Amino acid sequence: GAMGSMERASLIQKAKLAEQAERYEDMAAFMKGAVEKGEELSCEERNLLSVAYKNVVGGQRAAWRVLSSIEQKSNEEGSEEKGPEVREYREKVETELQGVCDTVLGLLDSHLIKEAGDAESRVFYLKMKGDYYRYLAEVATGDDKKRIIDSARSAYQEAMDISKKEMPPTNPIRLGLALNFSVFHYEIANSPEEAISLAKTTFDEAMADLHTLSEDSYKDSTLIMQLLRDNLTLWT
């Protein structure tokens, strides 16, 4: 690994600098190096890792969607043939995206998940596993599409089961997991009713537990609750 010679602490410091500079490819590379040191990640460090890869893959997903749209339009009646270029370039972006997903999934499997015993860490990583399988599912069209979808479902389900047992209904990790699993149901699993049920039940159970919270925890929880409401509004 190109980061093998750099101190763990220096990699974390640089990941923070890269975030300030909006250099998310750099940030992800730094965080990958930090994970490969083999020590567990603190909460702050887990969030650096997630921010970096979310921003890299987010950009790739947006580009993929632009290119897929152009490709779809090229295959409509009356569209002039323009050769293989659109498909080729969509494939290029797709392959890069799959590579990033495989990299993240690799870090999780070697060996973040297996060393994560606390609910907060384990749920966080399992949510990530679901998320990156979901990104793979978005672009999957072949023999393995069902298995990819099932891998996302399985990771999310394990995370949900732990979160319900071990975390309060206002915990931001529990909320963001439910938010994203709900989107999985709506966008990937062709289960809009499940998506809506999950988002509603999550919102309502969080609402009932807000009274237990400090001002700052209330801020954190209500932010994600609003995202649940935003999706419900989009879907109903």
């Binding site: 998320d131 963001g176 938010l179 994203n180 989107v183 709506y186 966008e187 994600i224 995202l227 935003d230 999706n231 989009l234 879907w235």
Partner: peptide, 5 residues
């Protein structure tokens, strides 16, 4: 597109 975190 729906919100995720």
């Amino acid at each position: 597109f729906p919100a995720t975190v």
